[model samples]
Target: PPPIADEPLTVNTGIYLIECYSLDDKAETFKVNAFLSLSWKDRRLAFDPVRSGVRVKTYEPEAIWIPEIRFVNVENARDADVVDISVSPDGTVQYLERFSARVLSPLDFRRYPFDSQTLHIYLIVRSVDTRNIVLAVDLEKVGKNDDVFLTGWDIESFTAVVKPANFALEDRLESKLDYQLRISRQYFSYIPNIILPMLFILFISWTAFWSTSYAANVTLVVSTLIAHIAFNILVETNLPKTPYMTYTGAIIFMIYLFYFVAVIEVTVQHYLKVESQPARAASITRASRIAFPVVFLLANIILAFLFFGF
Candidate 1:
């Protein structure tokens, strides 16, 4: 004796993310405060809000029957409010639930600071079969709050999709509603803090061409290389392990290659001078003074194109 019997319950779900913070890329988790609004046609409990003098009524969540709507990817529930019921004159019922929850969201860091991620809230019905229940969302109603400001992320768009679930052991199917938040990473901190310092190191290493002392030139280049490698290691330690290279890592690798080449150039010129080939040695040093900067600029241009797009 099911309540709806052969009729299907059509639930229209929408989400409004009020605030999101502490999106931990290494931990693969994020904290979010949001509201889930569910609307449906309920002829059984239809009443006029104005005549009833109550636009919405707060109810003990366990006091009445409700569809088993669950957040599939939620790692922990920090806070949740009792469900609020709102009824319209035309038998349209709306249920709004507010929650502050932590979710484990998988991320791709191949592009790192230049990357865009889609944070998802996967909702599914646990007790009802797809034949007796349906899940849907209106893309127009999916959004974030106006005052929402995440420190290093920009909310690009919100989207939703409805899909049917098929389980091998289950006899019936289930419906799942997926809400996605498209977020673009901001590079304000990285550019000034990490990128600028690394580029300055490259410039200082290139200056080694001006010094005629082999000991001084080699020492400068080697010191720069060591410092650059240490900086890269520090950066990598904060990021999650990934198979592909990221833009940040790629740029650091480029600098390492440049430093290695500079060291080899200085060694060759020093050996030439020691072997009594002063003219050849002077020519190589002069050529490097110009060639090093030109090649460095060209390599930077290529890397910019490869990582940040044209």
Candidate 2:
């Protein structure tokens, strides 16, 4: 038991980000380095400034009762390097530590390429016996370093929720603050890397409609289908696997459907020509030359609108 301070002590906390790397969508992890801060006033430790020369008193953090804070979202045990534990004449405690670890924040892959993520670090501290505690949002220390950057990703902002959540944990109380790092994919090179190449392969498959030889037509159609499969596989490797279908996945599946239709048309035209109806086969192929491209273009528009417009 201890003297009860009139006001419940409030802990002020903030994070200064150093850098973030390996923002992997497949695993939903990004290892980050940062400086952490926690401050609270201790009424029992107030001292006269004259004897201490008003210089902040330094002490080992374990020398005093600093609220033991831990992360709820971290995948593994995180080790932090103590920066300093200083005390003011007024018994204000200032604590700082340096930490780096891969965070286990969950990612929503529903939209994928169109997906933006709000990665989080959850701060939790269990309350000590009627040593009632509350958490605060210290905006003065909330920011990232200018050197912060993510490869092939855009970091919009690094911020924390103003109010901390207080919840009952078993028989005790706990505090939590969700630190958010908003990020999105870099799309500048995706056009050439995936979109254009996929389109060209699908277009190449259509050239089969122009040829009169069933042997050549079959080879061309089947070969392009295989190439499209290769491209789809390449893309599948880039994104995380999810039970729900993404727009990109839908588009890939849609291309396979088009290839299947192209194959059907090829066999149909062959049958018509073999039946000695040259006129009908010529008309069907001609119709396909226009119809295939038109239908594909329309399907893409609808998909794009559905994914982006909303």
Candidate 3:
């Protein structure tokens, strides 16, 4: 027989961190584990422990009337593998549920390596309406663990709050608890690996400005172009594809644009010398040497401001 659901159950939720999070863009999910404690008052089970020796203290969660709470954004919505329940003589019930799940979230990669992400675990009461139950977040125990350290990310903060759940096909508003984990990526590895090498390639591309021979200038510019493409491919292989341009992508595009213009500059200077304008060709080369570095530096500053806000 099903337990009676005549009264509204006020559930207080708290989270304890277990494993560090890893977000997979290709899979479109992130795995997380935590101790989910749900507490509520059950007036029907109120008893005096001193009077009745048959008082219920602690037992498996299945032996109690646990609410049908659902993790709506999770891929695995199965029952928790382990659940522990504690019941007090005053009808206070606390259920500690341990589970790991791959939850779906919208990832914005516009800033990518420089981006901050907030992954959420949204919970809702599946078997009852808001009139029968109300959800509340207990942040007192949310991050009581020391293992919230993600490998390549810094855990910014954790927050849990109750909000109205407006699911599709359901015109009625239901209450839901939203557990959010905010994180920022660590970009130290990318500096030495991607940014430095690209800077070197840009320096090499601009070296064509110092060369007088057309063949030498073209060789340097073309080689830099090849190196730029190689660097882009290496970075792209590790990243998921996105429709919007990322901060790193913007930087790479700037390098490619500079390299292409350097190649064109070489051709124009060669034609000027060919057309018996040696003085004009020399002047152009000198101007480019100063202009190339200045423009590149200024453009980088502008891009950084645009993407990272100074």
Candidate 4:
């Protein structure tokens, strides 16, 4: 039976996140280490102060009527490991356990790097023999550590919702607490590693646009396209692939068009000059000298605006 027979037992709970790691975006999972705090009172266990000669007693979990607490969204069923159970003279049981593992969390991508994510964790408890257990937030203990860090992400915030969601399930009621983790992708490191080198390659492809030598133009545009081809494949493979295209995906797709069409125009320009049609060949060549760059710059800024400003 519940400690409170007529009323449902309300267990005050708190969480202190110790360390954070493994923002496995590919699997939509985030791992965190944290201590779970739970407190409930049992009138029957109250001991006389002087007779017992003890202010507090440490009891094993099986010795008390602790709520059957579990994580609602965890990969493994055995999420929390028992650590300590303490009871004061008033029969106030304070239970603390530590848990760490992948939390099945939802994450959204703007098809690429944006605000990496605000993932979630759900802790729950179910009724024991129809003895309903409601959960409450202990505001003092709900916080993440200052030392938490991820390899490619910066931990922005780790906070829990005060109210628990209580609802019917399996012919009984259960309560769940929602904890959210905020993180932003590390951008500066990637910018220099991926985008800058690729952007520089794009410029290398276009230098033939102004250099004014047909023989050299083929080597510059074609060879630069090949290196960027290998470069894009190298970069994109490391990222989680999606059926839907990404911002950078579109950029690389744009690179192909510029390279492919640039080749087409070059062939046509040379063909026309060989056939004594230098009139259109020179005109097209001169127009292309700056046309590709203007559109390139325009497209890049437009993408930056949408991804950054939005």
Candidate 5:
């Protein structure tokens, strides 16, 4: 059905970005969903997802207009204008979707937390909607950490431009970026618990060094390998087999390799014990002690790099 030619509707459209900053802090990783609307041929229904680096300039003053949104009830809004809407101080302006965007740098809106905050001299809008339409407008990770200019909301003018009835900014409740991030946690289920834990278990088996008996060492090594095999099959049963290493699968592989090396060490120790007299056991133990420390340290370093990088 075609939209009515003259409906008392506002054109609520937006262009958003998912900007991420790399950091050593675990909480710095921001997860959020991005959504925006675009009309076709000035009236077409098809919409394509715009990504980072793509410029989205909505200049059709009579055809299309972007929604102005923000969190409201903020104490000071020096850089903002309050729209004629009944809003609460505790109520934050958010997209209906509620996508998540982490703010590592202090430059995020949360850093300002108040309308009295001064926007960039180039900020474009007169009033940001304080309710029901806060889209994800992350300004983090764009450039140097200290540079606040790289933050979002780069508008050419602050004047309220009147859009035509046919091209007014669409106004309907949409999930804010923060809410989307919270709900989208389920999407990353394939990661996190899957790979990292398996690797930890694998590394545990690698600790078979300096054991008093060959049997004890071998038992430890085999037990870890079996656990990994069990975990792998169980996880694989639920998930479609893929070429990529899941966080769990990668950890399991690392443990499996560790177990293999342990088996070799145990076998060599058993050989030495059988061929040498009782006096040589002490010397053999010392050799293993030295070798075990070196091997374990190296394995940890390698595993850390792989799991974190992967």
Candidate 6:
């Protein structure tokens, strides 16, 4: 038996709102109002209420899409700031101007647990120094169902993830703003952890100084140089070549330089002018022992300073 049909359900479509502000530190009056561009995967709403595949009453999508452009409030500024946000095919709310926007604002439905739809939002902020674009996603729990109708469909809430195009930072400084388009990824990414291990390896290279034999110590220094050369090459391959050196590259270069000096010192001790045979040799050994640890300590101190300061 076919179920009885009634008037189609109407649902509250606009449940979320976004606000933005922008500023420039240099100008006396600098503010701009902009609308975020919006988009999403196309969907057809017609559905079946019975096996005949006809939705007698009506069917509605669980989530409604809205795009607005705005800016963050920056008092005492000199430039206009705007946000271009969008809704991706996956339903991720992104800032879609020249760049993608993140769904950072919460729906007014707070206090009342979102019982309608789950929204995934993506946010991107610019890197001040590197001028690289960073993308991030946040999840919001909305409803228990996907069909957010005013009546029967309201109970069947659903979830969705969205994405926006990559863009630059939100800085007032034109020079500081870096708009290099980069591939998107989950935020708090794997970059730092990956580089940390390589830094640790450089630290380990200092330990070679403790070896009593000059030959063994020189071997460690030579090995460290070779390893750093390979490391730099590997890292550079993936890195966008630029005039500036990365902190990791700087550290590796410094370590290699230290090893070069150590090699010179080691070579000098093994082959230098000498008048006394056994006595001079013993003297040379004592000097070498003292110099090794001293130089090693100084190298670590410099490394620590570099890491902490720069």
Best by TM-score: 2
Off by over 4 Å in 6: 1-218, 272-310
Off by over 4 Å in 2: 1-4, 131-141
TM-score of each: 0.85, 0.95, 0.89, 0.89, 0.36, 0.34
TM-score of candidate 4 to 2 decimals: 0.89
| Residue 177 CA displacement from its true place in model 3, Å | 1.0
lDDT of each: 0.75, 0.82, 0.76, 0.77, 0.38, 0.36
TM-score of model 5 relative to the true fold?
A: 0.36
> How high is the lDDT of residue 278 in model 1?
85
Candidate 6 lDDT tens digits, 181-291: 111112122245434555555555555544445668677667766766776677656434445544545655666666665676555545542333545544655665566
Residues 1-310, candidate 4, lDDT per residue (tens digit)?
Answer: 4565556777877778887888776777867788888888887778888898678889888878777777878898646788888887897888888877778876665646545688777778788654555454656355677777777887787777778888888878888888777888877766787778878887888777565567998998899889888878976775676666677777777788889888888777788878798898888888887888888788779866766666
lDDT of 3 by residue, 1-310 (tens): 2234565446777777677566785665787777777887776667788887766688675567777677889887834665677787888886787877778988887887677888887777644443434455555446446766667888888877655454433554445777788888787888888889878988987788888888877788888889889999988876777888888998888788898788888899989999999889888888999998999899889998898894
What lDDT is obtained when candidate 1 is compared to the true structure?
Answer: 0.75
Clashes of each: 0, 0, 0, 0, 43, 40
**Which sequence of candidate numbers ranks them by TM-score, best first?**
2, 4, 3, 1, 5, 6
In candidate 1, what are the lDDT values of residues 18-102, reduced to their tens digit? 8888899888788888888777665655566777756554445554346667777888644778558766555565678887888
Q: Give the TM-score of candidate 3.
A: 0.89
How many clashes does the backbone of model 5 have? 43
Worst 10 residues of 5 by lDDT: 113-122
- Candidate 1 regions exceeding 4 Å error are 41-59, 87-92, 127-142, 162-169
The ten-residue window of minimal lDDT in model 2 covers: 131-140
Q: How does candidate 2 score on lDDT?
A: 0.82
